Each structure stands twice: as C-alpha cells, then as structure tokens.
Amino acid sequence: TYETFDPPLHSTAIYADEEEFSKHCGLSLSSTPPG
Amino acid sequence: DCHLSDMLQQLHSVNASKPSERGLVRQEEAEDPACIPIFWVSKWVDYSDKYGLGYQLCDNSVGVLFNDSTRLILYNDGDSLQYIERDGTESYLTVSSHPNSLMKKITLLKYFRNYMSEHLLKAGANITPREGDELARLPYLRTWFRTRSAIILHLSNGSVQINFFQDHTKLILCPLMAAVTYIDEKRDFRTYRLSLLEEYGCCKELASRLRYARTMVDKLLSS
Amino acid sequence: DCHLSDMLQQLHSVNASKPSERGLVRQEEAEDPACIPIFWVSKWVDYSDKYGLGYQLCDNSVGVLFNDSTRLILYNDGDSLQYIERDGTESYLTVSSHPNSLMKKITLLKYFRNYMSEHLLKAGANITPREGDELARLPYLRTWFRTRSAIILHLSNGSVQINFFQDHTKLILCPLMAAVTYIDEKRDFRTYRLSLLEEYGCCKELASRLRYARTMVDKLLSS
Numbered sequence: 001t002y003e004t005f006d007p008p009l010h011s012t013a014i015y016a017d018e019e020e021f022s023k024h025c026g027l028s029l030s031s032t033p034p035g
Numbered sequence: 036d037c038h039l040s041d042m043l044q045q046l047h048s049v050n051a052s053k054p055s056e057r058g059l060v061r062q063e064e065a066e067d068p069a070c071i072p073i074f075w076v077s078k079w080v081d082y083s084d085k086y087g088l089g090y091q092l093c094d095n096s097v098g099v100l101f102n103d104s105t106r107l108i109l110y111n112d113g114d115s116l117q118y119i120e121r122d123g124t125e126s127y128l129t130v131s132s133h134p135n136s137l138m139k140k141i142t143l144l145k146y147f148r149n150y151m152s153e154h155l156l157k158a159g160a161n162i163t164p165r166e167g168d169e170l171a172r173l174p175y176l177r178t179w180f181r182t183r184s185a186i187i188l189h190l191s192n193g194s195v196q197i198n199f200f201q202d203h204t205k206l207i208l209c210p211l212m213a214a215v216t217y218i219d220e221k222r223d224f225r226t227y228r229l230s231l232l233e234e235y236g237c238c239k240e241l242a243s244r245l246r247y248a249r250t251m252v253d254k255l256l257s258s
Numbered sequence: 259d260c261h262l263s264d265m266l267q268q269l270h271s272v273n274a275s276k277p278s279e280r281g282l283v284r285q286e287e288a289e290d291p292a293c294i295p296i297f298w299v300s301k302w303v304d305y306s307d308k309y310g311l312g313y314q315l316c317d318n319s320v321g322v323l324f325n326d327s328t329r330l331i332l333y334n335d336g337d338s339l340q341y342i343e344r345d346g347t348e349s350y351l352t353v354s355s356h357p358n359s360l361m362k363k364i365t366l367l368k369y370f371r372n373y374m375s376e377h378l379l380k381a382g383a384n385i386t387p388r389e390g391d392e393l394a395r396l397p398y399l400r401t402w403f404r405t406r407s408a409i410i411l412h413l414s415n416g417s418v419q420i421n422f423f424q425d426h427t428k429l430i431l432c433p434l435m436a437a438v439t440y441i442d443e444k445r446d447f448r449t450y451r452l453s454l455l456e457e458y459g460c461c462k463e464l465a466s467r468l469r470y471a472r473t474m475v476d477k478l479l480s481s
Contacts, residue, residue, distance in 0.1 A: 001149035007089075009081035009181075012156050012203060015362060018369050019222070021305075025373040029404070030303035032379050032426055 038193030042210040046249040049233045055242035065231035070214035073168045075207050076188050076196050077158045078151045089147030093159050097148045100176045107140050119175050162224050187251050261416030262479050265433040268452045269472040275456040278465035288454035293437035296394045298430045299411050299419050300381045301374040312370025316382050320371045323399045330363050410474045440464050
C-alpha cells in the first residue's frame with residue numbers, strides 16, 4: 001500500500017486488540033499478583 | 036428494496052413486543068446456530084474523502100465501493116475480480132488479464148487490501164466455516180453510512196451489518212432467515228431467530244441495539 | 259547522574275561499616291519516619307519484547323517507558339498526560355484532547371493500566387499518604403533493567419527501587435535524604451537513615467540487600 005495511503009478512519013487496528021495484550025501480559029514477567 | 040422492507044417488518048414486530056420488558060427473559064432459547072451467516076464484513080477502511088470505502092469479508096475476499104458508486108471485488112484466490120457498475124451491471128476479470136480501463140481501480144484495491152492486512156484486526160476470526168459455504172455467491176457492498184455511534188453496511192445479498200464504535204459490538208441482520216447475529220464486547224458470536232426473541236425475550240443490551248437497527252433500516256429506506 | 263553518584267557513596271559508606279557484624283544491633287534506632295518516600299513503583303509488567311515496560315506509581319498514576327526511549331504518564335485524574343520524548347522534552351496534554359501523534363501510545367498505556375488494576379497487587383498499600391504529598395512533582399521511569407533475581411527501577415527524582423522476585427522484598431533508596439525504605443516478606447515497611455544504620459547496625463537481611471543494591475547502582479552508572 002502506498003506511502004501516501006493514509007486512511008483517516010478504519011476498523012480496529014491490530015495493536016488495539018486488548019485481549020491479546022492482556023494475554024501476553026499474563027505470559028510475560030510482571031509484579032506480584034494477588035495470592 | 037424487498038429485503039430491507041422485510042427486515043423492517045421483522046424488526047418492528049420484535050421491537051413492538053418490548054422483548055427486554057418481560058418477567059423472565061430467556062434469550063438463549065432464541066439461539067439457532069443453523070442461521071449463522073456465511074458472509075459478514077470483517078475489516079473496513081473509510082477513505083471516502085478521496086477514494087471510497089474498502090473492506091474485507093470473512094472469507095478474506097476484499098472489496099472497494101468507490102466514490103463514483105462502482106465496486107471492485109477481489110476473491111480470496113487473489114486474482115479473480117468482479118466489477119459492478121453504478122447501475123449494478125456485473126462483469127468478471129482477473130488481476131492478470133484485465134481491461135486497461137480498470138488498472139487504476141485495481142491498484143487502489145491492492146492498496147486497500149494491503150493496508151487492511153498489515154494494520155487491521157479481523158473481526159469474527161473465531162467463527163469457522165461450513166462445507167458448501169465456499170460455493171456461496173460473494174456479495175458486494177451496496178451502500179454504507181456512518182453515524183456518531185456506528186457504521187452501517189448494506190450488502191447486496193440483503194444483509195445489514197451494524198458495527199458499534201464504542202464497545203466493538205456488531206449486529207448482522209439476515210432478512211432471508213429473519214435472524215440476527217450479535218457479536219458482543221467479549222467477541223462471542225450468537226445467532227438468534229427474531230421470532231424467538233419476540234416470544235422468549237432478550238436482554239436490554241440486545242434490545243437497544245435492535246431498536247437502533249430499526250432506526251438505521253428506516254434511514255436506509257429513506258435514502 | 260549526580261544523584262546516582264551520591265547514592266553510591268552512601269551505599270559504599272553503609273556497606274563499609276559492616277552493619278550486620280555487630281556485637282549488638284539496634285536497627286530500630288536507625289528508623290526515621292520523616293524520610294518515608296512520596297513515590298514508589300507499586301505495579302509493573304514487562305512487555306519489552308514489543309511495546310515496553312508499564313508501571314504504576316503508589317499515587318495510582320500510570321506510566322510506560324516505550325522501546326523507543328519515550329515515556330508517557332497518565333496522572334491520577336484519569337485524563338491528564340505527560341509525554342517525555344527521547345530528548346527529554348516534557349510536553350503536557352490530555353486524553354480528552356485526542357492527540358493523533360500519540361493516539362496509539364495512549365491506547366497501549368490504557369491497556370497496561372487495565373491489566374495491572376485487574377491482575378496485580380499494589381505494593382505498599384498499607385502506606386497512608388501525608389498532606390502536601392499530592393502537590394509533589396510526579397517522577398517518571400528514567401531507566402530499568404532485570405537480573406535473574408530482581409528488577410531495578412530508576413526514577414527521575416533520583417530514587418532507585420529494587421524488587422526481589424523470589425521473596426517479594428523491596429528496597430526504595432532515596433539519595434536526597436540518604437535513606438532507604440525496606441519492605442520485608444510480611445509487607446512491613448520500615449524507613450531508615452543510611453548513616454544511622456552505620457551507627458546502630460542492622461540484620462543481615464537488610465545488610466545483604468544493601469550490598470546487592472550497591473552493585474546495581476554501579477551498573478546504572480556504567481550505562
């Protein structure tokens with residue numbers, strides 16, 4: 001897709017997938033969770 | 036449109052019954068997975084300020100409704116194309132052998148296709164197809180419009196899709212089966228017979244989106 | 259930089275006094291509640307393989323240090339923002355302003371915020387803040403690194419915090435007051451003057467972690 005191709009409006013972007021975000025957070029290292 | 040008129044009557048019948056105003060709502064009794072849609076819009080790109088509206092269907096085909104009211108569809112084989120003129124006349128061609136007069140629209144479709152594959156999440160990726168759905172005739176986008184709360188997509192097979200911006204919920208209205216598929220904020224995919232939602236009731240979230248849907252179908256018919 | 263050098267001299271001094279090898283230890287006499295910190299890291303999640311490291315401060319503010327060496331803070335009001343570029347240029351804005359150049363980073367920060375609030379415990383929850391604390395300048399995460407045994411967090415106000423993974427003990431070092439707050443396994447918080455630990459002694463648990471902290475501060479200065 002071209003360098004000048006900059007749609008102003010569109011459906012949800014890949015980065016905006018919070019279910020994959022929260023997923024990866026659970027697989028990665030993090031501070032302590034409730035026991 | 037005969038299908039929009041049926042859809043309106045279907046929606047008026049259920050909404051008039053006030054399905055969420057019931058002693059006991061039994062929405063699950065209205066589920067009919069035999070009415071799952073074959074096609075829905077899984078991605079869309081609103082470049083109508085310059086080129087038009089590009090979109091992906093759940094079978095990974097893509098299309099563009101250009102600002103001149105023509106449509107170009109690329110099938111999921113990556114080479115077969117269908118061109119629909121303003122007046123609905125359909126013609127078939129390929130990326131490899133095509134009229135020279137379509138080269139610019141083909142190039143624009145490829146930009147849309149690529150922008151969607153690189154940047155956008157695919158909605159309904161959790162729904163698996165059935166045998167015999169590959170022979171189904173690909174619909175094209177007949178018309179669309181955007182509101183403060185949603186984008187409304189009217190497919191040539193009669194189905195109307197409403198994507199709500201704030202919570203990512205979606206309705207897929209099938210007038211041929213008097214059914215609706217609701218994708219909730221958790222991305223769960225449930226398909227209901229409208230007649231059974233009228234009889235058994237439904238929750239307030241779905242009831243309100245079905246009132247919204249009726250407002251949008253009235254708008255589509257007004258245009 | 260100059261705060262790290264002070265911290266190293268303070269740690270060198272305390273460790274050189276061998277505070278746990280005393281005939282009599284009176285660690286309680288080294289306590290000084292007047293040096294309790296204003297800010298510390300209460301939560302964090304390592305998404306550095308893609309986006310960066312998100313964290314929560316004890317005032318419920320949220321921050322993220324992105325892999326592009328930029329920082330974005332969401333104050334505790336839930337809308338105010340502060341964006342620190344690679345150069346260090348502090349720019350202030352809001353989530354309501356809907357900035358376009360940062361729209362993506364805001365979305366990721368909100369996702370960090372959500373995960374931490376629903377999955378992670380607030381370290382130092384038992385600390386009741388004082389008056390005038392709410393007027394203090396919010397720091398940001400200058401840098402951080404992880405060993406096999408601990409995560410090292412260097413805040414812009416000069417504080418260095420070390421969280422030990424296995425037993426959940428934590429050090430919050432304050433060079434401005436030559437003090438240290440120690441959170442033990444039981445989540446009991448104690449704040450000490452480093453110079454008074456030299457003079458009264460301390461348990462080997464705190465002494466060994468101050469030895470470790472010195473080598474970590476040396477690492478921060480080598481980078």
